[PDB]
């Protein structure tokens, strides 16, 4: 457990924190906007996961300024996490 494992390990933990907080903040931001569908927590968590994994079906998405702002954080933290693990497994193989 040097640096190339603690980084990916913390990123995975941080990601889960972002997913939980992101789904919570999304509901807070999306409510008050007529037509918004991202207004309940259980499906907001499902949205955050498919957002952080860059899947993004289209069944759920933010339509507000702060809602979309929260979404961007979920994307970046998502790509970084899934990208930091990739760079982690790369360094592992290089050192044999």
């Amino acid at each position: 457990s040097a640096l190339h494992w603690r980084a990916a390990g913390a990123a995975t933990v941080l990601l889960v924190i972002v997913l939980l907080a992101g789904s919570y903040l999304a509901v807070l931001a999306e409510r008050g906007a007529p037509g918004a569908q991202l207004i309940t927590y259980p499906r907001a968590l499902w949205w955050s996961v498919e957002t952080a994994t860059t899947v993004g079906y289209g069944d759920l998405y933010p339509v507000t300024l702060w809602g979309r702002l929260v979404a961007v954080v979920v994307m970046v933290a998502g790509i970084t996490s899934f990208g930091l693990v990739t760079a982690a497994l790369a360094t592992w193989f290089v050192g044999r």
Partner: antibody
Amino acid sequence: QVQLQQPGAELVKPGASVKLSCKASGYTFTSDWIHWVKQRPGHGLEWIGEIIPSYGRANYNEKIQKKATLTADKSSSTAFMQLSSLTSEDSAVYYCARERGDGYFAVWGAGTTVTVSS
Amino acid sequence: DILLTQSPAILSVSPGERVSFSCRASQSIGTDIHWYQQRTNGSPRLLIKYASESISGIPSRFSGSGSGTDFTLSINSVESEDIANYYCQQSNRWPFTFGSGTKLEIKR
């Protein structure tokens, strides 16, 4: 036990104001939403607004006249609805309901019969 | 805003007979509909959540069905304690909206 305690009635003069309360009991999570529903006699249920005590943000029904201002108190776990400048059209039973942030209203209050008269 | 229409407004039925209430949305809301009950001088009581999912405490007679725009609340063999107003409420899009309500009437 009763999870939402509301005052029995509140007499208001035309043009004055009143502050209804909604004391909560039982499990009070941080993801709880407190809603307020207006019901005139002979009519149906009418959504007024919502508020999450944790953050303090409140939303209101834009389809009707903005006359209610939702506030909360995390200390005593009670929700408040400030009705301003009431007329004869505002005389109704005002319920309060707890939502777990999953859509439905699990528990309703007994309702506060607000009467606007001189 | 999503409009919720309940037809008819009044529903007459003989005792021990199956009855069905109707709730139609102006647009597709999936299964995000909820049924409530309100007797005379009483507060609304959650009967069914999410179209068909039952609530603990509510008798077995109360069932739920429907998806998209059309939804139905059913009572298997209606008895006298079911005399009340039945409302439907959606939670698919903000803001939440209620139905016009349907009053159950038993002809004895």
